PDB file of N, CA and C in Angstrom:
ATOM      1  N   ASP A   1     -85.507 -17.466 209.257  1.00  0.00           N
ATOM      2  CA  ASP A   1     -84.654 -16.392 209.387  1.00  0.00           C
ATOM      3  C   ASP A   1     -84.566 -15.548 208.257  1.00  0.00           C
ATOM      4  N   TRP A   2     -83.985 -14.344 208.474  1.00  0.00           N
ATOM      5  CA  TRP A   2     -83.986 -13.143 207.458  1.00  0.00           C
ATOM      6  C   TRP A   2     -82.843 -13.287 206.444  1.00  0.00           C
ATOM      7  N   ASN A   3     -81.726 -14.051 206.768  1.00  0.00           N
ATOM      8  CA  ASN A   3     -80.557 -14.060 205.859  1.00  0.00           C
ATOM      9  C   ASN A   3     -80.572 -14.797 204.552  1.00  0.00           C
ATOM     10  N   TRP A   4     -81.573 -15.793 204.523  1.00  0.00           N
ATOM     11  CA  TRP A   4     -81.529 -16.641 203.311  1.00  0.00           C
ATOM     12  C   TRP A   4     -81.992 -15.829 202.150  1.00  0.00           C
ATOM     13  N   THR A   5     -82.701 -14.646 202.375  1.00  0.00           N
ATOM     14  CA  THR A   5     -83.123 -13.860 201.343  1.00  0.00           C
ATOM     15  C   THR A   5     -81.948 -13.202 200.621  1.00  0.00           C
ATOM     16  N   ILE A   6     -80.817 -13.107 201.189  1.00  0.00           N
ATOM     17  CA  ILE A   6     -79.651 -12.671 200.647  1.00  0.00           C
ATOM     18  C   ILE A   6     -79.235 -13.519 199.422  1.00  0.00           C
ATOM     19  N   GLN A   7     -79.316 -14.903 199.689  1.00  0.00           N
ATOM     20  CA  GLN A   7     -78.878 -15.775 198.753  1.00  0.00           C
ATOM     21  C   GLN A   7     -79.898 -15.832 197.554  1.00  0.00           C
ATOM     22  N   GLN A   8     -81.224 -15.811 197.877  1.00  0.00           N
ATOM     23  CA  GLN A   8     -82.349 -15.921 197.021  1.00  0.00           C
ATOM     24  C   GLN A   8     -82.623 -14.604 196.221  1.00  0.00           C
ATOM     25  N   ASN A   9     -82.558 -13.438 196.867  1.00  0.00           N
ATOM     26  CA  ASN A   9     -83.092 -12.237 196.344  1.00  0.00           C
ATOM     27  C   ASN A   9     -81.907 -11.244 196.383  1.00  0.00           C
ATOM     28  N   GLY A  10     -81.016 -11.261 197.170  1.00  0.00           N
ATOM     29  CA  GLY A  10     -79.864 -10.390 197.220  1.00  0.00           C
ATOM     30  C   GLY A  10     -80.041  -9.447 198.375  1.00  0.00           C
ATOM     31  N   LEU A  11     -81.295  -9.195 198.801  1.00  0.00           N
ATOM     32  CA  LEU A  11     -81.616  -8.279 199.831  1.00  0.00           C
ATOM     33  C   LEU A  11     -81.150  -6.889 199.620  1.00  0.00           C
ATOM     34  N   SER A  12     -81.612  -6.305 198.504  1.00  0.00           N
ATOM     35  CA  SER A  12     -81.193  -5.024 198.161  1.00  0.00           C
ATOM     36  C   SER A  12     -82.533  -4.308 197.566  1.00  0.00           C
ATOM     37  N   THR A  13     -82.614  -2.984 197.894  1.00  0.00           N
ATOM     38  CA  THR A  13     -83.804  -2.191 197.432  1.00  0.00           C
ATOM     39  C   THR A  13     -85.106  -2.738 198.062  1.00  0.00           C
ATOM     40  N   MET A  14     -85.013  -3.643 198.874  1.00  0.00           N
ATOM     41  CA  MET A  14     -86.106  -4.201 199.597  1.00  0.00           C
ATOM     42  C   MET A  14     -86.488  -3.429 200.875  1.00  0.00           C
ATOM     43  N   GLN A  15     -85.496  -2.656 201.182  1.00  0.00           N
ATOM     44  CA  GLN A  15     -85.598  -1.955 202.537  1.00  0.00           C
ATOM     45  C   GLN A  15     -86.721  -0.951 202.609  1.00  0.00           C
ATOM     46  N   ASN A  16     -87.072  -0.267 201.594  1.00  0.00           N
ATOM     47  CA  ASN A  16     -88.185   0.590 201.560  1.00  0.00           C
ATOM     48  C   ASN A  16     -89.433  -0.231 201.777  1.00  0.00           C
ATOM     49  N   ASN A  17     -89.558  -1.430 201.214  1.00  0.00           N
ATOM     50  CA  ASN A  17     -90.655  -2.250 201.308  1.00  0.00           C
ATOM     51  C   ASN A  17     -90.885  -2.582 202.764  1.00  0.00           C
ATOM     52  N   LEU A  18     -89.809  -3.079 203.435  1.00  0.00           N
ATOM     53  CA  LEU A  18     -89.896  -3.382 204.771  1.00  0.00           C
ATOM     54  C   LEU A  18     -90.320  -2.277 205.612  1.00  0.00           C
ATOM     55  N   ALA A  19     -89.826  -1.097 205.218  1.00  0.00           N
ATOM     56  CA  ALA A  19     -90.096   0.218 205.878  1.00  0.00           C
ATOM     57  C   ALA A  19     -91.620   0.474 205.885  1.00  0.00           C
ATOM     58  N   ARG A  20     -92.210   0.083 204.680  1.00  0.00           N
ATOM     59  CA  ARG A  20     -93.630   0.222 204.593  1.00  0.00           C
ATOM     60  C   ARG A  20     -94.437  -0.477 205.520  1.00  0.00           C
ATOM     61  N   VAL A  21     -93.968  -1.773 205.880  1.00  0.00           N
ATOM     62  CA  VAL A  21     -94.697  -2.520 206.773  1.00  0.00           C
ATOM     63  C   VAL A  21     -94.532  -2.037 208.228  1.00  0.00           C
ATOM     64  N   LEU A  22     -93.202  -1.875 208.693  1.00  0.00           N
ATOM     65  CA  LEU A  22     -92.665  -1.505 209.925  1.00  0.00           C
ATOM     66  C   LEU A  22     -93.101  -0.176 210.517  1.00  0.00           C
ATOM     67  N   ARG A  23     -93.386   0.849 209.719  1.00  0.00           N
ATOM     68  CA  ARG A  23     -93.681   2.125 210.084  1.00  0.00           C
ATOM     69  C   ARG A  23     -95.013   2.344 210.857  1.00  0.00           C
ATOM     70  N   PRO A  24     -94.951   3.221 211.919  1.00  0.00           N
ATOM     71  CA  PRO A  24     -96.148   3.385 212.606  1.00  0.00           C
ATOM     72  C   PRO A  24     -97.159   4.041 211.812  1.00  0.00           C
ATOM     73  N   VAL A  25     -98.455   4.000 212.085  1.00  0.00           N
ATOM     74  CA  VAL A  25     -99.515   4.506 211.199  1.00  0.00           C
ATOM     75  C   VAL A  25    -100.268   5.209 212.183  1.00  0.00           C
ATOM     76  N   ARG A  26    -100.892   6.461 211.873  1.00  0.00           N
ATOM     77  CA  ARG A  26    -101.909   6.928 212.664  1.00  0.00           C
ATOM     78  C   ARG A  26    -102.842   7.814 211.931  1.00  0.00           C
ATOM     79  N   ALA A  27    -104.033   7.982 212.554  1.00  0.00           N
ATOM     80  CA  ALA A  27    -105.092   8.771 212.027  1.00  0.00           C
ATOM     81  C   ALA A  27    -106.158   8.922 213.245  1.00  0.00           C
ATOM     82  N   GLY A  28    -106.746  10.043 213.382  1.00  0.00           N
ATOM     83  CA  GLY A  28    -107.546  10.399 214.410  1.00  0.00           C
ATOM     84  C   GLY A  28    -108.851   9.574 214.246  1.00  0.00           C
ATOM     85  N   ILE A  29    -109.241   8.713 215.321  1.00  0.00           N
ATOM     86  CA  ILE A  29    -110.456   8.085 215.342  1.00  0.00           C
ATOM     87  C   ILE A  29    -111.200   8.710 216.585  1.00  0.00           C
ATOM     88  N   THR A  30    -112.392   9.099 216.330  1.00  0.00           N
ATOM     89  CA  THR A  30    -113.196   9.566 217.501  1.00  0.00           C
ATOM     90  C   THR A  30    -114.137   8.418 217.801  1.00  0.00           C
ATOM     91  N   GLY A  31    -114.621   8.421 218.993  1.00  0.00           N
ATOM     92  CA  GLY A  31    -115.464   7.273 219.441  1.00  0.00           C
ATOM     93  C   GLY A  31    -116.199   7.374 220.617  1.00  0.00           C
ATOM     94  N   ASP A  32    -116.456   6.394 221.209  1.00  0.00           N
ATOM     95  CA  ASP A  32    -117.181   6.189 222.462  1.00  0.00           C
ATOM     96  C   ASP A  32    -116.326   5.322 223.497  1.00  0.00           C
ATOM     97  N   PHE A  33    -116.715   5.614 224.704  1.00  0.00           N
ATOM     98  CA  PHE A  33    -116.195   4.883 225.884  1.00  0.00           C
ATOM     99  C   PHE A  33    -117.325   4.426 226.635  1.00  0.00           C
ATOM    100  N   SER A  34    -117.344   2.968 226.758  1.00  0.00           N
ATOM    101  CA  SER A  34    -118.457   2.364 227.426  1.00  0.00           C
ATOM    102  C   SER A  34    -118.046   1.202 228.180  1.00  0.00           C
ATOM    103  N   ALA A  35    -118.875   0.549 229.022  1.00  0.00           N
ATOM    104  CA  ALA A  35    -118.407  -0.531 229.824  1.00  0.00           C
ATOM    105  C   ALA A  35    -119.706  -1.000 230.469  1.00  0.00           C
ATOM    106  N   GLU A  36    -119.539  -2.144 231.224  1.00  0.00           N
ATOM    107  CA  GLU A  36    -120.572  -2.706 231.939  1.00  0.00           C
ATOM    108  C   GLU A  36    -120.917  -1.761 233.195  1.00  0.00           C
ATOM    109  N   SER A  37    -122.155  -1.855 233.862  1.00  0.00           N
ATOM    110  CA  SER A  37    -122.505  -1.026 234.955  1.00  0.00           C
ATOM    111  C   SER A  37    -121.512  -1.054 236.083  1.00  0.00           C
ATOM    112  N   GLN A  38    -121.256  -0.028 236.806  1.00  0.00           N
ATOM    113  CA  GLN A  38    -120.219   0.210 237.636  1.00  0.00           C
ATOM    114  C   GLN A  38    -120.773   0.835 238.918  1.00  0.00           C
ATOM    115  N   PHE A  39    -120.036   0.929 239.960  1.00  0.00           N
ATOM    116  CA  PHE A  39    -120.298   1.572 241.232  1.00  0.00           C
ATOM    117  C   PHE A  39    -119.872   2.944 241.018  1.00  0.00           C
ATOM    118  N   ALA A  40    -120.511   3.844 241.707  1.00  0.00           N
ATOM    119  CA  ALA A  40    -120.254   5.320 241.672  1.00  0.00           C
ATOM    120  C   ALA A  40    -120.740   5.827 243.099  1.00  0.00           C
ATOM    121  N   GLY A  41    -120.231   7.013 243.389  1.00  0.00           N
ATOM    122  CA  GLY A  41    -120.564   7.545 244.741  1.00  0.00           C
ATOM    123  C   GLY A  41    -120.723   9.035 244.731  1.00  0.00           C
ATOM    124  N   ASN A  42    -121.064   9.547 245.876  1.00  0.00           N
ATOM    125  CA  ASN A  42    -121.237  10.999 245.914  1.00  0.00           C
ATOM    126  C   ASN A  42    -121.193  11.532 247.274  1.00  0.00           C
ATOM    127  N   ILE A  43    -120.873  12.749 247.468  1.00  0.00           N
ATOM    128  CA  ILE A  43    -120.959  13.324 248.714  1.00  0.00           C
ATOM    129  C   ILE A  43    -121.636  14.772 248.712  1.00  0.00           C
ATOM    130  N   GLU A  44    -122.691  15.031 249.524  1.00  0.00           N
ATOM    131  CA  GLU A  44    -123.275  16.357 249.502  1.00  0.00           C
ATOM    132  C   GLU A  44    -123.090  16.860 250.733  1.00  0.00           C
ATOM    133  N   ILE A  45    -123.040  18.202 250.878  1.00  0.00           N
ATOM    134  CA  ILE A  45    -122.843  18.926 252.161  1.00  0.00           C
ATOM    135  C   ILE A  45    -123.912  19.793 252.290  1.00  0.00           C
ATOM    136  N   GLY A  46    -124.488  20.107 253.550  1.00  0.00           N
ATOM    137  CA  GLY A  46    -125.628  20.866 253.866  1.00  0.00           C
ATOM    138  C   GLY A  46    -125.160  22.322 254.032  1.00  0.00           C
ATOM    139  N   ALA A  47    -126.181  23.255 254.504  1.00  0.00           N
ATOM    140  CA  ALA A  47    -125.845  24.497 254.760  1.00  0.00           C
ATOM    141  C   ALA A  47    -125.406  24.467 256.381  1.00  0.00           C
ATOM    142  N   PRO A  48    -124.349  25.100 256.678  1.00  0.00           N
ATOM    143  CA  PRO A  48    -124.034  25.130 258.120  1.00  0.00           C
ATOM    144  C   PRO A  48    -124.954  26.087 258.856  1.00  0.00           C
ATOM    145  N   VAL A  49    -125.939  25.573 259.482  1.00  0.00           N
ATOM    146  CA  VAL A  49    -126.918  26.442 260.182  1.00  0.00           C
ATOM    147  C   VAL A  49    -126.404  27.080 261.413  1.00  0.00           C
ATOM    148  N   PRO A  50    -126.536  28.463 261.512  1.00  0.00           N
ATOM    149  CA  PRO A  50    -126.034  29.133 262.609  1.00  0.00           C
ATOM    150  C   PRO A  50    -126.595  28.576 263.908  1.00  0.00           C
ATOM    151  N   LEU A  51    -125.635  28.248 264.884  1.00  0.00           N
ATOM    152  CA  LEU A  51    -126.098  27.804 266.213  1.00  0.00           C
ATOM    153  C   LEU A  51    -125.830  28.794 267.162  1.00  0.00           C
ATOM    154  N   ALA A  52    -126.441  28.683 268.222  1.00  0.00           N
ATOM    155  CA  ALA A  52    -126.186  29.668 269.351  1.00  0.00           C
ATOM    156  C   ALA A  52    -126.418  29.005 270.579  1.00  0.00           C
ATOM    157  N   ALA A  53    -125.695  29.526 271.725  1.00  0.00           N
ATOM    158  CA  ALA A  53    -125.678  28.971 272.971  1.00  0.00           C
ATOM    159  C   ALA A  53    -126.997  29.478 273.736  1.00  0.00           C
TER     160      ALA A  53
ATOM    161  N   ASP B   1    -173.585   3.009 260.781  1.00  0.00           N
ATOM    162  CA  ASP B   1    -174.350   2.774 259.617  1.00  0.00           C
ATOM    163  C   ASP B   1    -175.751   2.639 259.929  1.00  0.00           C
ATOM    164  N   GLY B   2    -176.109   2.946 261.159  1.00  0.00           N
ATOM    165  CA  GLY B   2    -177.481   2.969 261.673  1.00  0.00           C
ATOM    166  C   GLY B   2    -177.653   1.331 262.026  1.00  0.00           C
ATOM    167  N   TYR B   3    -176.739   0.653 262.524  1.00  0.00           N
ATOM    168  CA  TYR B   3    -176.879  -0.576 262.916  1.00  0.00           C
ATOM    169  C   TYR B   3    -176.372  -0.640 264.494  1.00  0.00           C
ATOM    170  N   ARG B   4    -176.829  -1.596 265.261  1.00  0.00           N
ATOM    171  CA  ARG B   4    -176.642  -1.756 266.591  1.00  0.00           C
ATOM    172  C   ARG B   4    -175.200  -2.038 267.046  1.00  0.00           C
ATOM    173  N   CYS B   5    -174.496  -2.615 266.041  1.00  0.00           N
ATOM    174  CA  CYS B   5    -173.049  -3.079 266.203  1.00  0.00           C
ATOM    175  C   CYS B   5    -172.278  -2.013 266.971  1.00  0.00           C
ATOM    176  N   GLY B   6    -171.305  -2.417 267.811  1.00  0.00           N
ATOM    177  CA  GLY B   6    -170.456  -1.741 268.615  1.00  0.00           C
ATOM    178  C   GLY B   6    -169.444  -0.935 268.018  1.00  0.00           C
ATOM    179  N   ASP B   7    -169.170  -0.915 266.725  1.00  0.00           N
ATOM    180  CA  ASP B   7    -168.022  -0.187 266.077  1.00  0.00           C
ATOM    181  C   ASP B   7    -168.104   1.318 266.410  1.00  0.00           C
ATOM    182  N   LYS B   8    -166.834   1.944 266.379  1.00  0.00           N
ATOM    183  CA  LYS B   8    -166.518   3.265 266.643  1.00  0.00           C
ATOM    184  C   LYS B   8    -165.411   3.661 265.943  1.00  0.00           C
ATOM    185  N   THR B   9    -165.291   4.990 265.640  1.00  0.00           N
ATOM    186  CA  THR B   9    -164.172   5.341 264.862  1.00  0.00           C
ATOM    187  C   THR B   9    -162.981   5.810 265.817  1.00  0.00           C
ATOM    188  N   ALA B  10    -161.694   5.510 265.466  1.00  0.00           N
ATOM    189  CA  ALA B  10    -160.655   5.863 266.275  1.00  0.00           C
ATOM    190  C   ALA B  10    -159.481   6.409 265.429  1.00  0.00           C
ATOM    191  N   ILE B  11    -158.709   7.233 266.027  1.00  0.00           N
ATOM    192  CA  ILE B  11    -157.597   7.963 265.283  1.00  0.00           C
ATOM    193  C   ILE B  11    -156.429   7.580 266.118  1.00  0.00           C
ATOM    194  N   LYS B  12    -155.386   7.156 265.466  1.00  0.00           N
ATOM    195  CA  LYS B  12    -154.122   6.803 266.006  1.00  0.00           C
ATOM    196  C   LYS B  12    -153.337   8.067 266.328  1.00  0.00           C
ATOM    197  N   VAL B  13    -152.493   7.975 267.399  1.00  0.00           N
ATOM    198  CA  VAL B  13    -151.487   8.904 267.634  1.00  0.00           C
ATOM    199  C   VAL B  13    -150.272   8.150 267.040  1.00  0.00           C
ATOM    200  N   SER B  14    -149.431   8.994 266.273  1.00  0.00           N
ATOM    201  CA  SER B  14    -148.375   8.438 265.595  1.00  0.00           C
ATOM    202  C   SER B  14    -147.314   8.171 266.548  1.00  0.00           C
ATOM    203  N   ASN B  15    -146.323   7.194 266.035  1.00  0.00           N
ATOM    204  CA  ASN B  15    -145.078   6.970 266.812  1.00  0.00           C
ATOM    205  C   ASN B  15    -144.202   8.053 266.245  1.00  0.00           C
ATOM    206  N   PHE B  16    -144.304   9.107 267.010  1.00  0.00           N
ATOM    207  CA  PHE B  16    -143.744  10.409 266.563  1.00  0.00           C
ATOM    208  C   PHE B  16    -142.220  10.326 266.231  1.00  0.00           C
ATOM    209  N   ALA B  17    -141.904  11.073 265.071  1.00  0.00           N
ATOM    210  CA  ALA B  17    -140.608  11.092 264.467  1.00  0.00           C
ATOM    211  C   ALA B  17    -140.471  12.497 263.957  1.00  0.00           C
ATOM    212  N   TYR B  18    -139.295  13.139 264.199  1.00  0.00           N
ATOM    213  CA  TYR B  18    -139.070  14.563 263.848  1.00  0.00           C
ATOM    214  C   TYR B  18    -137.721  14.761 263.255  1.00  0.00           C
ATOM    215  N   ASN B  19    -137.577  15.870 262.553  1.00  0.00           N
ATOM    216  CA  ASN B  19    -136.310  16.293 262.025  1.00  0.00           C
ATOM    217  C   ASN B  19    -136.212  17.785 262.022  1.00  0.00           C
ATOM    218  N   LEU B  20    -135.001  18.338 262.297  1.00  0.00           N
ATOM    219  CA  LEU B  20    -134.938  19.703 262.483  1.00  0.00           C
ATOM    220  C   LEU B  20    -133.786  20.370 261.783  1.00  0.00           C
ATOM    221  N   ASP B  21    -134.166  21.199 260.868  1.00  0.00           N
ATOM    222  CA  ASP B  21    -133.272  22.020 259.969  1.00  0.00           C
ATOM    223  C   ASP B  21    -132.644  23.113 260.794  1.00  0.00           C
ATOM    224  N   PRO B  22    -133.349  23.780 261.601  1.00  0.00           N
ATOM    225  CA  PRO B  22    -132.724  24.920 262.222  1.00  0.00           C
ATOM    226  C   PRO B  22    -131.764  24.523 263.550  1.00  0.00           C
ATOM    227  N   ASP B  23    -131.188  25.597 264.002  1.00  0.00           N
ATOM    228  CA  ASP B  23    -130.169  25.755 265.153  1.00  0.00           C
ATOM    229  C   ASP B  23    -131.015  25.523 266.474  1.00  0.00           C
ATOM    230  N   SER B  24    -132.293  25.752 266.376  1.00  0.00           N
ATOM    231  CA  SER B  24    -133.224  26.041 267.530  1.00  0.00           C
ATOM    232  C   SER B  24    -133.235  24.892 268.502  1.00  0.00           C
ATOM    233  N   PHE B  25    -132.365  23.902 268.619  1.00  0.00           N
ATOM    234  CA  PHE B  25    -132.531  22.969 269.662  1.00  0.00           C
ATOM    235  C   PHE B  25    -131.176  22.391 270.218  1.00  0.00           C
ATOM    236  N   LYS B  26    -131.047  21.933 271.498  1.00  0.00           N
ATOM    237  CA  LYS B  26    -129.899  21.589 271.961  1.00  0.00           C
ATOM    238  C   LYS B  26    -130.081  20.546 273.135  1.00  0.00           C
ATOM    239  N   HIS B  27    -128.875  19.902 273.469  1.00  0.00           N
ATOM    240  CA  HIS B  27    -128.856  19.085 274.570  1.00  0.00           C
ATOM    241  C   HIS B  27    -127.921  19.545 275.488  1.00  0.00           C
ATOM    242  N   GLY B  28    -128.369  19.532 276.833  1.00  0.00           N
ATOM    243  CA  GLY B  28    -127.442  20.213 277.848  1.00  0.00           C
ATOM    244  C   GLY B  28    -126.388  19.352 278.279  1.00  0.00           C
ATOM    245  N   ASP B  29    -125.843  19.532 279.524  1.00  0.00           N
ATOM    246  CA  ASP B  29    -124.696  18.938 280.074  1.00  0.00           C
ATOM    247  C   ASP B  29    -125.084  17.471 280.285  1.00  0.00           C
ATOM    248  N   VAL B  30    -124.169  16.595 280.257  1.00  0.00           N
ATOM    249  CA  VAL B  30    -124.324  15.180 280.396  1.00  0.00           C
ATOM    250  C   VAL B  30    -124.154  14.878 282.001  1.00  0.00           C
ATOM    251  N   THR B  31    -124.941  13.771 282.529  1.00  0.00           N
ATOM    252  CA  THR B  31    -124.683  13.413 283.819  1.00  0.00           C
ATOM    253  C   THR B  31    -124.447  11.815 283.671  1.00  0.00           C
ATOM    254  N   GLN B  32    -123.560  11.475 284.599  1.00  0.00           N
ATOM    255  CA  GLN B  32    -123.391  10.067 284.510  1.00  0.00           C
ATOM    256  C   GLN B  32    -123.952   9.330 285.778  1.00  0.00           C
ATOM    257  N   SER B  33    -125.163   8.498 285.570  1.00  0.00           N
ATOM    258  CA  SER B  33    -125.859   8.020 286.500  1.00  0.00           C
ATOM    259  C   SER B  33    -124.943   6.993 287.282  1.00  0.00           C
ATOM    260  N   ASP B  34    -124.282   6.012 286.446  1.00  0.00           N
ATOM    261  CA  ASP B  34    -123.437   5.026 287.015  1.00  0.00           C
ATOM    262  C   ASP B  34    -122.298   5.026 286.059  1.00  0.00           C
ATOM    263  N   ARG B  35    -121.114   4.451 286.591  1.00  0.00           N
ATOM    264  CA  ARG B  35    -119.945   4.242 285.681  1.00  0.00           C
ATOM    265  C   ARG B  35    -119.252   3.067 286.077  1.00  0.00           C
ATOM    266  N   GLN B  36    -118.641   2.244 285.302  1.00  0.00           N
ATOM    267  CA  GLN B  36    -117.834   1.189 285.672  1.00  0.00           C
ATOM    268  C   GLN B  36    -116.599   1.289 284.848  1.00  0.00           C
ATOM    269  N   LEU B  37    -115.381   1.217 285.406  1.00  0.00           N
ATOM    270  CA  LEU B  37    -114.127   1.446 284.667  1.00  0.00           C
ATOM    271  C   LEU B  37    -113.844   0.128 284.088  1.00  0.00           C
ATOM    272  N   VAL B  38    -113.753   0.064 282.614  1.00  0.00           N
ATOM    273  CA  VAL B  38    -113.300  -1.197 281.980  1.00  0.00           C
ATOM    274  C   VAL B  38    -111.876  -1.321 281.911  1.00  0.00           C
ATOM    275  N   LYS B  39    -111.088  -0.260 281.454  1.00  0.00           N
ATOM    276  CA  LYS B  39    -109.524  -0.435 281.395  1.00  0.00           C
ATOM    277  C   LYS B  39    -108.912   0.803 281.398  1.00  0.00           C
ATOM    278  N   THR B  40    -107.467   0.675 281.604  1.00  0.00           N
ATOM    279  CA  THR B  40    -106.678   1.905 281.613  1.00  0.00           C
ATOM    280  C   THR B  40    -105.340   1.578 281.028  1.00  0.00           C
ATOM    281  N   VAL B  41    -104.748   2.384 280.368  1.00  0.00           N
ATOM    282  CA  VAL B  41    -103.311   2.246 279.833  1.00  0.00           C
ATOM    283  C   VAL B  41    -102.668   3.511 279.995  1.00  0.00           C
ATOM    284  N   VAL B  42    -101.234   3.425 280.535  1.00  0.00           N
ATOM    285  CA  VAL B  42    -100.657   4.535 280.801  1.00  0.00           C
ATOM    286  C   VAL B  42     -99.318   4.610 280.054  1.00  0.00           C
ATOM    287  N   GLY B  43     -98.636   5.676 280.029  1.00  0.00           N
ATOM    288  CA  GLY B  43     -97.420   5.744 279.101  1.00  0.00           C
ATOM    289  C   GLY B  43     -96.683   7.057 279.258  1.00  0.00           C
ATOM    290  N   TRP B  44     -95.583   7.172 278.716  1.00  0.00           N
ATOM    291  CA  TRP B  44     -94.841   8.422 278.832  1.00  0.00           C
ATOM    292  C   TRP B  44     -93.719   8.418 277.792  1.00  0.00           C
ATOM    293  N   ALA B  45     -93.204   9.633 277.457  1.00  0.00           N
ATOM    294  CA  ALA B  45     -92.058   9.847 276.532  1.00  0.00           C
ATOM    295  C   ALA B  45     -91.006  10.434 277.478  1.00  0.00           C
ATOM    296  N   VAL B  46     -89.751   9.882 277.449  1.00  0.00           N
ATOM    297  CA  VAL B  46     -88.838  10.596 278.139  1.00  0.00           C
ATOM    298  C   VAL B  46     -87.700  11.135 277.234  1.00  0.00           C
ATOM    299  N   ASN B  47     -87.505  12.395 277.361  1.00  0.00           N
ATOM    300  CA  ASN B  47     -86.706  13.170 276.478  1.00  0.00           C
ATOM    301  C   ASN B  47     -85.538  13.954 277.225  1.00  0.00           C
ATOM    302  N   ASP B  48     -84.508  13.311 277.712  1.00  0.00           N
ATOM    303  CA  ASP B  48     -83.480  13.963 278.494  1.00  0.00           C
ATOM    304  C   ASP B  48     -82.735  14.849 277.646  1.00  0.00           C
ATOM    305  N   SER B  49     -82.376  14.428 276.415  1.00  0.00           N
ATOM    306  CA  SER B  49     -81.403  15.201 275.533  1.00  0.00           C
ATOM    307  C   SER B  49     -82.024  16.574 275.033  1.00  0.00           C
ATOM    308  N   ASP B  50     -81.149  17.469 274.895  1.00  0.00           N
ATOM    309  CA  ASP B  50     -81.591  18.760 274.557  1.00  0.00           C
ATOM    310  C   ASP B  50     -82.168  18.851 273.169  1.00  0.00           C
ATOM    311  N   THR B  51     -81.535  18.402 272.190  1.00  0.00           N
ATOM    312  CA  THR B  51     -82.036  18.634 270.889  1.00  0.00           C
ATOM    313  C   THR B  51     -83.159  17.800 270.238  1.00  0.00           C
ATOM    314  N   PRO B  52     -83.206  16.527 270.362  1.00  0.00           N
ATOM    315  CA  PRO B  52     -84.226  15.567 269.803  1.00  0.00           C
ATOM    316  C   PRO B  52     -85.520  15.732 270.503  1.00  0.00           C
ATOM    317  N   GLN B  53     -86.476  16.555 269.979  1.00  0.00           N
ATOM    318  CA  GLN B  53     -87.778  16.503 270.608  1.00  0.00           C
ATOM    319  C   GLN B  53     -88.715  16.141 269.657  1.00  0.00           C
TER     320      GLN B  53
END
């Protein structure tokens, strides 16, 4: 538990240290997207040829 | 090859197959030589009331 620190260290001025760990961190990482081989598909349409009676 | 054997050259007619890009072909009206009736199902919607259609 967190409370025993109060007896041992007082739990003061620590807060910023905890903040250092807890805060979100971000930086742009560029990269690749890859995976195992997968299914894919396709649809092609032709020219609609003029028909007559 | 200048030998008495029976051999002669032969050229096969193909098992014809065709494809047609153009509009240039057509099938006429259908005729039914014979017909047997497998099944029939009948139904109706009754809508007496004015509004709900």
